[PDB]
Design a protein around this ligand. Structure first.
Ligand SMILES: *C(=N)c1nc(-c2ccc(OCCCN3CCN(C)CC3)c(C(F)(F)F)c2)cc2c1ncn2C
Length: 217
């Protein structure tokens, strides 16, 4: 395995999104992972519709729109639905709405997803290096996460109980402090211009390897 990876250098990561007051983190995390696989498959980097998940990957998928949901069940929706719309055709509104999916605006498909074994940061590393960005849950229920500005994040009261969906788009180290490079959906002013570097190989810190998954086109 490489010591460091950044999928942004590979042209596989779209712009940071702003979820606002709608708890659609899980939606953005899911489309983020599929965006990278879309680029790898087709040559096109295209922001996919988070809103489509919020409106359509709903009760049947155990999801609750702006009050939270699961990346894995979002992927199954895209599989079952035979498509997800582009973000251009179905833009983000930060609210729960009626499903407005239309196949005429399909930007991606999904054929399968893979759920990584619980707490294994080495298995996560291998997936990030070799497959693509990986959707992850983390514990973001601490003020230090909201206050994060720069560097490698480490919260000693962090648990392995995850409650916020994000996207691991790389890993590396800062002067020997190992990190996961995380794309969040709290807009381009959060942390390092949309990103947070989270402690890696620190005993599954904030549950970052608790529930990892990735899709395939
Ligand atoms: C995002 N803005 C947001 N996210 C959540 C939320 C709650 C719980 C979550 O994970 C549940 C544990 C993992 N499960 C995966 C599927 N398995 C079958 C069962 C276990 C997540 C997740 F998936 F990690 F991202 C997110 C709640 C939110 C929320 N905004 C507002 N609320 C209440």
């Amino acid at each position: 395995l490489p010591d460091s990876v950044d999928w942004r250098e590979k042209g596989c990561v779209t712009e940071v999104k702003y979820q606002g007051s709608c708890g659609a983190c899980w939606a953005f995390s899911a489309v983020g992972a599929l965006e990278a696989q879309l680029k790898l498959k087709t040559g096109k980097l295209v922001s996919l519709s988070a809103q489509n998940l919020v409106d359509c990957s709903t009760e049947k998928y155990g999801n609750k729109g702006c009050n939270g949901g699961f990346m894995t069940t979002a992927f199954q929706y895209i599989i079952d639905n035979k498509g997800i719309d582009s973000d251009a055709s179905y833009p983000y509104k930060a609210m729960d709405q009626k499903c407005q999916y239309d196949s005429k605006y399909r930007a991606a498909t999904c054929s399968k997803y893979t759920e990584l074994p619980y707490g294994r940061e080495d298995v996560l590393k291998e997936a990030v290096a070799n497959k693509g960005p990986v959707s992850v849950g983390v514990d973001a229920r601490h003020p230090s996460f909201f206050l994060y500005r720069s560097g490698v994040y480490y919260e000693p009261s962090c648990t392995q109980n995850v409650n916020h969906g994000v996207l691991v788009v790389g890993y590396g180290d800062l002067n020997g402090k190992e990190y996961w490079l995380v794309k969040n959906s709290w807009g381009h002013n959060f942390g390092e211009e949309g990103y947070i570097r989270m402690a890696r190989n620190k005993g599954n810190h904030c549950g970052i390897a608790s529930f990892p998954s990735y899709p395939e086109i």
